[PDB]
Design a protein around this ligand. Sequence first.
Ligand SMILES: OC[C@H]1O[C@H](O)[C@H](O)[C@@H](O)[C@@H]1O
Ligand SMILES: OC[C@H]1O[C@H](O)[C@H](O)[C@@H](O)[C@@H]1O
Lengths: 729, 729
Amino acid sequence: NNNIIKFDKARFTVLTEHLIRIEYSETGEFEERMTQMVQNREFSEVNFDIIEKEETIEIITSTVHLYYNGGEFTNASLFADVKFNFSVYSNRWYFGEKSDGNLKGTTRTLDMIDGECPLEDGIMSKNGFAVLADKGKVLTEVGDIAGNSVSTIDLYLFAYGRDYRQALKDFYQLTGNTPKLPRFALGNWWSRYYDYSDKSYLALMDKFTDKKVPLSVSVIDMDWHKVSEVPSRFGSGWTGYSWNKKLFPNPENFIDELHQRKLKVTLNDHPADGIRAFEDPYPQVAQTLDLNTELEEAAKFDFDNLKFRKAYFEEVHGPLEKEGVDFWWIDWQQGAISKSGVDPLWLLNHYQYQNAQKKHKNNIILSRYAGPGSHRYPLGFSGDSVISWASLDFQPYFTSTASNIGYTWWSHDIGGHMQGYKDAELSLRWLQFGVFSPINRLHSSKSEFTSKEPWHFDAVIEQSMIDFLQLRHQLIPYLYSANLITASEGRALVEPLYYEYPMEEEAYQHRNQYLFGEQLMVAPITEKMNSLLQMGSVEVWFPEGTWYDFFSGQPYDGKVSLKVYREITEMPVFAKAGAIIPLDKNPLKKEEIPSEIIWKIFPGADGEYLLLEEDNETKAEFVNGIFTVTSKKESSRKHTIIYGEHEIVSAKRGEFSIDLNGKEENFDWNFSTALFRRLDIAEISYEQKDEILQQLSLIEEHEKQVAFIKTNENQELQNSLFELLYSGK
Amino acid sequence: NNNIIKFDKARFTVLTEHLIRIEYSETGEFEERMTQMVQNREFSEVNFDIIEKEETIEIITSTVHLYYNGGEFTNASLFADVKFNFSVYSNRWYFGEKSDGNLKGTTRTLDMIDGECPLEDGIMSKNGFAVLADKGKVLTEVGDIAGNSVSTIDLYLFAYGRDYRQALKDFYQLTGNTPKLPRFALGNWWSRYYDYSDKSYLALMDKFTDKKVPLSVSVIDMDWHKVSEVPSRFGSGWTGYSWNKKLFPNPENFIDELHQRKLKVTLNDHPADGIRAFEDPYPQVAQTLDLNTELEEAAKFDFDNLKFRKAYFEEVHGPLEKEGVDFWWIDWQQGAISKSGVDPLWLLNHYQYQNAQKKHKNNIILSRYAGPGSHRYPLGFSGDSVISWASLDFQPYFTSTASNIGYTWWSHDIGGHMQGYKDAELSLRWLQFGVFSPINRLHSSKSEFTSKEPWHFDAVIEQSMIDFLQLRHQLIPYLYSANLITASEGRALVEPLYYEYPMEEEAYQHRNQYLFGEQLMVAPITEKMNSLLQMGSVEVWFPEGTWYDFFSGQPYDGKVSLKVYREITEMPVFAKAGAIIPLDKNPLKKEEIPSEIIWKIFPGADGEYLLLEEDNETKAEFVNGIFTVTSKKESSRKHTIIYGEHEIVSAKRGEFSIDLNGKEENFDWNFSTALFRRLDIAEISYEQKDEILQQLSLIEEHEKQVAFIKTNENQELQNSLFELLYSGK
Ligand SMILES: OC[C@H]1O[C@H](O)[C@H](O)[C@@H](O)[C@@H]1O
Ligand SMILES: OC[C@H]1O[C@H](O)[C@H](O)[C@@H](O)[C@@H]1O
């Protein structure tokens, strides 16, 4: 109320020093109701100043001057100067105009996208301000669409400068926090647009077990329902709510079998053709909606209609949930048209997410992005990406940049959805990224040739995919703790580099590089390997400090930008001196919570990690070479400790503390072994290999080893040898 | 009043046989006030005819039929047929529609343009008509913005056919003539976006003197004011009105020192962030504008506001003008937004140009183009061109085409502003064009690497730049006389070829070729030299008549299109038989008016030149080999005469006449010397050089010399040798 100012037909609410709501009302009434985007305008009071005259008003905070000259909002009447110097003359917002500096957000979908597509703006800007227009409908108390806002213009001016994390936290306070995911969502999902039988699906699930690949989720795509069995007078088989009985003669029994294998089960739902007269639930729906059954009147999709939504959840989904379906894959691609003006995809995500909470605690959906605030309905489903290096090269940037509009749970089809071209190396690189993405869901097109099964590929590719898929389940504790941090504290699992390093120009120059939780920095390789090196590469920016390759221990002295090379089976993931990462020791075990945690410690500095769980909190501290583990509640959990290289403690129960000062701090990784391996795999001349090995062995001074490699005629081989010299310096 | 016709809600004013004002008024009131564009609708009466019926009206002049069918102006209701056959079916104007043939005009700026950008239409068309919409606000008697015209549509139909010069003269009568420039504007300007001190700036000015480079103007860019010293709470240091005291501890003394060196002084003004609380004039401005100083209320830029404009001119510029600032570089790039709907750049140019007349007679500004009529506020400042061959290749066309909307004083950054790439040959070619452009202002970016100082470059490039910079000061008499002709007679200094040769197709095919005053035709080279020839080239159209290279005397028989080759140190500039060009003999002397004029005469025909000056008129006549000089008033001025090659008279005082009939008419230039030089510099085989020299020396018949060069395997060498044979024919 002191944070509220009316002037002419406008209303201004100073929510934080850095966040102002700006409204216009012809009627003099302004909007207090929630909207599709905004769930909460309750914020603690803040200091600001006002200069009010007859004709004009200026609102002044620590970061912004907002001016209003009266009348209708125009670029001339409503504008703001930030109190920052990030630019020479892009420090002014004008109503209705775009400025430079927006770091972007996300978009609905990657359907049919081969590589890059345009993104919407987010709330983050290098120049320190962004405007988020609220164009949505108002809600009722219980979250039904109520109609048009009486605030016919309703904007949020963000003026956080480059405090991106606080901008995002306050956005979550305005639009509501992301809910907690359930632990099962963070495991591997299996999916394929393939007409499995109950028998061939269970045989595939048992082959995953036999192949030592853990799964959390069993997706059944659209061939679960009638497709070619649909008479053409009704249109296509794309939408379906009736089991194909040939393939699934006893659905509940099939779902019981997946449940006995400790899998959660989801079905594809294409809702757009509604419930037509051939469907199994049609007689019930027709009775509830008073349809003309002798004229075979369809229950057309209509999520604006309360009776339709009830029949959809109770009489269409209800019978399938009773057969054991755990959650819904909402797969909408049929446009944004409704008589209400609300995007049907928005109505589906909002209502289905709420309905999912009835059957299961912290339940999810799987659906496309439905605009600002739709993070309240995880998980994101990016859809029909084209299978290409260009698509993979876009995806890490896409994923990290989405955190800028608070949409932090994108599930991409890992390996790409459709079209494009076969390349087992592309499939393996894509799975490496997926394992270090918010969700790891293997999925593919209707092709006989696009299965993401590891054993589709040669023995090298298969073993590497199996190792990465196991690593995903090892990461579930770290992922689930970051998930609770997203839900409780408004911090993204995947952050662009500029969230941690806002003032470092290099944090804006590595689009595909990101922080993954608080302990790991990932630089996926998204380019086909150089056949002369038998290695792929990516330019990595190393922030100030000592960094270790998470897998090898190879060290890097920051701050530096350095091209790094990896075999197709290895991924650039880095941890700082002092990093502590927990890993499940038993990733193949079907355990609700890990019976055994490996604490992986990176030497050379202090650190700590807080492991949040369903029913506990465990703190791991590393302070002057003393490692301590405590928990809120006690348990039988057995702790394993790995300090750099060496397993120090194995399966020790309860709370404890152990001194690692005089333990071996150094990893195995050495310049000589790594040099030999890189030269050995290279498809270069044996004379060159022999000369490089002899000269780098005989030349003692680091500066002369570098001078030697600088004479090499292969420019990319120079860069690979320079990486090793830089790490071995 | 007889030249005025009302019909339905329309008003038509026949201003010339070739110019009709077309107005629409809902209210039946039509607009008599001046607008931002139009200063004068007083024109002498002309004959025309009217066919008026109940429903329709036709106005008939010597060149156009204008029809109006009544009602609202639409493409169907308002249209015109020209009485010309320049096209088969583009001879009709339709209201609101574009036709072919417009020869274009100019645009606001070359900021961030690498090469070509789109231009606005001008008033010139190959098909003989153009419409100039007046969309501006009305003015008061004294030239303040009065608001919206009551003529809610106000157009000028030009139907001059290809009498382009008369179209432009009548446009100047409608919109007001260009003012006279002061003589100092036509000299060399020094500018660099560089943080000079008072000491390093004067040392640079004294280095120009020592290097024999004359300057008229000393520009001080934005580092004159506080930049990094501005607290970030106020935004950037881009706008500033406070001297940086480290660099300029005594500003008035520094400006007195430039004034003692006979330089005019301008400062960069970035007006867009107005006068903020840290500035030195802020306490005065705050008092005048009743600002809240304890809340550090900014005097935001507002040129719609009379009190703001007064405080800006009196309390912000005023104290700097008293320190000695001669005129203002208005450097606006922050958009076209104002509550009035008037472009802030327009308000700045109109008001600053008027305010500049208080301190100095015929004073100037330096600012971007602000639309039709803004020629009333010279000089044009094109801004942040990209440093490239593509940008230089665009600039002569840009400059000549601007005359088509009467904007004849463009000042380009000579050598290009920013980004792009280093090439000393590009810098030298750019300076050659600049010397033959309306204004010769050297300027460059904030780079340590972009200085336009001649001694930045090697000895060859340096000497050539020094020779061109001296030539600019030799040209000041010719430039200042053309300036008075622009102001008094509405003729551009720089004309496209089609102004003189409207019916010659070739005058439309040499975009970069132009007339420079009445005596010189310029074809700048704007392409990197061919390294095999060690020469650059340009295709020149030579109109009917005998033409001489202005520098060498090399002759050309028109009419012909011919590729001409020059070393990087030489520029294609041509004069007709009979041409008389005055040159200052003492370009390095700091003389208000030249004490000594060289009259350079090209033989083979009669001619004359009228030298207009501040306080005199001198006529030079060349009639059957008799050269006479007379003046309105007498003086001590000493005249030197150069007839072709030879200095005939040296430093002869007062009026006189001398017979040159039996003086040597022929220049030195000869085929043999020129051939030897071209072969000698070429990076071709010595066997080829030897064979070409021997064959062209031994073959006597011109047609067989041409047949010989036609067999040469080097196509561009053929063209170079053909130029020499054509000149030596
Ligand atoms: O259900 C069949 C297919 O439908 C749509 O194209 C989905 O976006 C895709 O994920 C799915 O495999
Ligand atoms: O004042 C610094 C710079 O500002 C703008 O970019 C001007 O257009 C340029 O001419 C100047 O050097």
